[PDB]
Amino acid sequence: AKQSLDVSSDRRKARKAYFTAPSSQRRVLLSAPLSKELRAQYGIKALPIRRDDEVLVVRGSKKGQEGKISSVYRLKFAVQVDKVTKEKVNGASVPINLHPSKLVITKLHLDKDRKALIQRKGGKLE
Amino acid sequence: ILQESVLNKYRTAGQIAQTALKYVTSLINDSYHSKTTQRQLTVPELCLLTDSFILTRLEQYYKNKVNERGIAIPTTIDIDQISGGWCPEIDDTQNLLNWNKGKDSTFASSVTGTLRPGDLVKITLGVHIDGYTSEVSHTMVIYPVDETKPILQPTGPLLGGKADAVAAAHIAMETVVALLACALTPEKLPASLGGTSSGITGQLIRTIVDTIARSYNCGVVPGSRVRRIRRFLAGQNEGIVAEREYKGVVWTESHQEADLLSAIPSDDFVVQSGEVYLIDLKMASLEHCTKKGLVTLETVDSYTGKSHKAGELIARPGAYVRDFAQTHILKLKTSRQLLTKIDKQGVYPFKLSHLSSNFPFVHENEEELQSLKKDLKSFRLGMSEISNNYLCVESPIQIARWVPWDHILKATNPNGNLSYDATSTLTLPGHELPLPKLGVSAIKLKSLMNSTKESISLPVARECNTIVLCDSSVSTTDRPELLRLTGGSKTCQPSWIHSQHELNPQDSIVQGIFQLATLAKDKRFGLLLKETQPMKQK
């Protein structure tokens, strides 16, 4: 149960907030957990998913498939992985929209900012 | 059907083309290699003087006897990555400088018009008489001049991927000439290369050319062909105008896809006697390609606002093509007069400077050049309305580009076969499928090429000849022989190059090539290859 008077339990307000959230909030909303090995290596549980990291699909019909994040389509709350597609006979290939909470990060794309994020979340890289 | 008169017309056109090519080679050597000339000639000046020399030589032959004669392919000079279509007008120099201000230095030779050491300069020109066409194209190399030596010679050979491309193109030209000459004496074809009772096929042509390109670590640029030439139908505009009947062998991105996996041209033909064949070969160096990729072409426009890319060339094509199936009465008098002159020209691609009454100039004068430019400004005014109503089209400027296969495989196209560029002016390349097996269209492939960061450009070398298969009756000496109308050891003499590759002799196709070279070098009991000689000038 909530204890703050500044937090709302109203379903209508929560859903309006989710569906009108801007792009910077959608980045936080589209977080993904790390794998077991990465979790032990970095000491953190989940990160906001970004464009160049490698994932494992752990739910849905495409379960067990791996690949690199191709795009983070925040407008449609989805991510697209390069190896996870649907094909037609005329040669068409349509990316599968995957939700990042149904993925698992297996390799992180590290930069200065990402390292700072891990270290301020309590990571212990290298 | 061949005849003495047809053969004579082909011989005359070929001699004119050889003389023009020798003239431009001498001009390049005087401007950059001999360095005796005070002023260095630039590319548009070279093209203009070449066209004038061709017209003045052609005026003397077949007067009041032939309905149509003139320049078949306007003089084109291409540099390195630029694979064709570069015949700029003289009134576009300041335009090119202004357009390419703030760009890279990669196309500096073409932007400025001044050649630079190490450049692969490809010269292409063709002459038609009564619709009987002879075309020639030769790659040469620009070298720095030595100083210590008494005699002007290069400091060293051309080295690297450009040398690989030049060698591949030259050896492919020689081997194809020998193979097509073996069609007249089929019993002389080497046993391993093909059957003693078997003829020459486009399959054999393709596999020999591919073997040579693979040996020299080069690709075959998708514009290459070995086709048959008929009266008024020489493929003078192959990517623009369609043809009812086609007999020859082409290379495309589709052929590259099929090779990696293993009106429509097909290699299911036998080379027959008494025919004229054009062989045009472009070899692209794959020196900087550390992976396996696809060789394609990027088209040049005149819009500097279409992107922010630093290594992009901005230019406007100089050659136009008249579409005689389209009729529309223009509203400008200048436009109507220009259309009358364009219809006077013919079914060959033309330059606006070719349409001036002053051109060709009797005496190269400053006032003559000024009068030509004065005509040229009004010609541009008329040309804008002529092209706005689809009466003429531009023959494109193309750059050879390399796209790696992993990007194509990872890319997703939601439309597949159905996607096509509907804003394209020309129907033939607009409705194109470079990858029939993968369902990747031309517009999709252009998008992938532009999106790649590893899509680089490739230097290209070019060799193109015209040959006639003269029978026992048609030839002088009562034996069949191959008459090379243009090209050979007098005009298309190779530059000084050195390559680290060679054909590995442990291949049957390579052994057949070597046997063909032996039979060519034999002049008594082998192949008879009679080369057309340039006429004298001074």
UniProtKB/Swiss-Prot annotation, chain A:
This is Large ribosomal subunit protein uL24A. One of its GO terms (molecular function) is structural constituent of ribosome. Its main location: cytoplasm. It comes from Saccharomyces cerevisiae (strain ATCC 204508 / S288c). SUPFAM superfamilies: Translation proteins SH3-like domain (SSF50104). GO terms for biological process: cytoplasmic translation; ribosomal large subunit biogenesis. CDD domains: KOW_RPL26 (cd06089). InterPro entries: KOW, Rib_uL2_dom2, Ribosomal_uL24_CS, Ribosomal_uL24_euk/arc, Ribosomal_uL24_KOW, Translation_prot_SH3-like_sf.
From Swiss-Prot, chain B:
It is an enzyme of class 3 (hydrolase). It is found in: Cytoplasm; Nucleus. Its main location: cytoplasm. InterPro entries: Creatinase/aminopeptidase-like (IPR036005), PA2G4/ARX1 (IPR047113), WH-like_DNA-bd_sf (IPR036388). GO terms for cellular component: cytoplasm; nucleolus; nucleoplasm; nucleus; preribosome, large subunit precursor. Keywords: Cytoplasm, Hydrolase, Metal-binding, Metalloprotease, Nucleus, Protease. GO terms for biological process: proteolysis; ribosomal large subunit export from nucleus. Its EC number is 3.-.-.-. Disulfide bonds: none annotated. GO terms for molecular function: metal ion binding; metallopeptidase activity. It comes from the Eukaryota. Present with 45100 molecules/cell in log phase SD medium. Component of the nucleoplasmic and cytoplasmic pre-60S ribosomal particles. Interacts directly with REI1. Belongs to the peptidase M24 family. Probable metalloprotease involved in proper assembly of pre-ribosomal particles during the biogenesis of the 60S ribosomal subunit. Accompanies the pre-60S particles to the cytoplasm. This is Probable metalloprotease ARX1. The gene is ARX1.
